[PDB]
Amino acid sequence: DRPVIVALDLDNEEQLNKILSKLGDPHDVFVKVGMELFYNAGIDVIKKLTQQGYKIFLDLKMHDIPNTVYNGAKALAKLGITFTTVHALGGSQMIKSAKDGLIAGTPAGHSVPKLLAVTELTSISDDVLRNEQNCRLPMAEQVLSLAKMAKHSGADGVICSPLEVKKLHENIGDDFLYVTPGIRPATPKMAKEWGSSAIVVGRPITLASDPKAAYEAIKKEFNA
Amino acid sequence: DRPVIVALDLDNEEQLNKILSKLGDPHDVFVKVGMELFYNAGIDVIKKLTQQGYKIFLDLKMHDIPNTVYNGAKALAKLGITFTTVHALGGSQMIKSAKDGLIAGTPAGHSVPKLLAVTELTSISDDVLRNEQNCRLPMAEQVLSLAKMAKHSGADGVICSPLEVKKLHENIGDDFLYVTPGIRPATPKMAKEWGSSAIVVGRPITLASDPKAAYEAIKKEFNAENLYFQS
C-alpha cells in the first residue's frame, strides 16, 4: 500500500486545523505543507500535529551551504515529520549533510524523515532553464542528472513528474522513492503503473464536497 | 549609514539572548539568523526581537515556485525584518513575486524589507558548478548574469564576495545593495574601499572578549569615509 499525500495551500494554523478535521483520523492523514504555512505559524504547530499521528511532508526545499542545511534539517527532524525536501541544485555535499542532519535531530523512537530532492521546479520552463538558469543541458537530461546524483549522495527519493517516473525509475532502480505530484482522477492508477512510490494530490481532494471521501477514494484508486 | 550585520550561528533562544545582551542597545544592532536558528525558534522569537528594535537579516534563501515564494515572503515581512534572501536560480518571476510578497506583508508605516538575491553559493566550486549543477557558463559570467537578472526582477541587492563587488557594480550600478559576508579584521576597510553596501561579520564579534567594542570598532572602520586628509 503506497501513500497518498494531500497537498495543502494555506497560510494559517486555523485553515490547517479545518482541512485536517475534514480529512479523517490523524493516523490516516498524510499532508504536505510548505513555507506559506510554516513561515506563518508558531514553531510548535507541526510538532503538535505529528504528536497526534498526522504524517507531514514539510516541503521547504532547503538550499544553502552544507553546514547550514545540516542544522536546518536537524531542526526539522525534531518536529516529527515524515518527508522533507532539499534542492539537488545545492549539490552532493549539501544533500549528504542534509541526511546527517535529519539523522541527528530525529528524536528517540522515531523514524528518520525521508530526504527528497527537488530537481527542476515546475516553474522552470525550457526557456528559463536555458536563458535564466544558464544550464548546458535540456530538461530531460538535467533532471535525470540531478536525480541520479541525489540517489548517489544519500537522498531517499526525488520529486518527479508522473510522466518521468517510468524512465527515472529505470535508471536509478527500486531503492528510492519516486514522489509524483500533479495527480488528478495523470490518474492515481496510471501513477501506480508507471512506478510512483507516493502520489501528492491537491485540489481534487482539498476542494472536494467531502475531502475525506475524496481522499479515501484516491487511496483505493492508487492501491487497487 | 552603512550597516554592519552580526552573523549569529546558534540553535537556541537562550544562547541568542546572551550574545545579544553583549552587542549594545537594540536600536544599534543588526543581526543575521538563518535556518539554524529560525527552524528551531520560529516566528515569535523574530517578532519579539524586531519589536524591541533589532534589525534582522532573516537569511532563509527561499527557492520555490513564484506563488509559494510570494506567500513565504509575505509571511516574513509580517515579522518586521530588514533584509531577506532568495535564490536567483529560482528565476525571474520568482524574484518579482518575492518582492510583491514582501510589499503585501509589510505593516503600514513600516519599511519594506530589502530583497537580496543569492547567486552561486560559496559551497559551489567551479567543478560543482560544471559537473553537478550543469551550468554552461564559467563562475564569473554566471554570477554576473544571475545578479543582473535579479536587479531587473525587483531584487534590491545581492549577496556577493568583497572581491566581486567591482564587476557587479560596473554592470548594475548604485541603485542596489552589495552585501558581503567574508569580513574579518578582507577587512572592513577594504570592504568600504571596494564599495560594499553592508558587511556581515561573525566570530570576530561574537567570540570577541568584548563583543560590543569589537562591533563598534568595526562599524567605525567600515564607515570611515574620510579616513585620511586629502587636498
From Swiss-Prot, chain A:
GO MF annotation terms: orotidine-5'-phosphate decarboxylase activity
Give GO cellular component annotations, separated by semicolons. cytosol
Annotated coiled-coil positions are none
Any Gene Ontology biological process: 'de novo' UMP biosynthetic process
- List, alphabetically, the InterPro entries matched: Aldolase_TIM (IPR013785), OMPdecase (IPR014732), OMPdecase_AS (IPR018089), OMPdecase_bac (IPR047596), OMPdeCOase_dom (IPR001754), RibuloseP-bd_barrel (IPR011060)
* UniProt KW keywords: Decarboxylase, Lyase, Pyrimidine biosynthesis
* Record field: catalytic activity: orotidine 5'-phosphate + H(+) = UMP + CO2
Q: What is its EC number?
A: 4.1.1.23
Pathway the protein contributes to: Pyrimidine metabolism; UMP biosynthesis via de novo pathway; UMP from orotate: step 2/2
The disulfides recorded in the entry are: none
Location of the active site = K61
Report residues binding substrate. Answer: 9, 32, 59-68, 122, 184, 202-203
Entry similarity comment? Belongs to the OMP decarboxylase family. Type 1 subfamily.
Q: How does it assemble?
A: Homodimer.
The role this protein plays is:
Catalyzes the decarboxylation of orotidine 5'-monophosphate (OMP) to uridine 5'-monophosphate (UMP).
What's the protein here called?
Orotidine 5'-phosphate decarboxylase
The gene from which this protein is expressed is pyrF
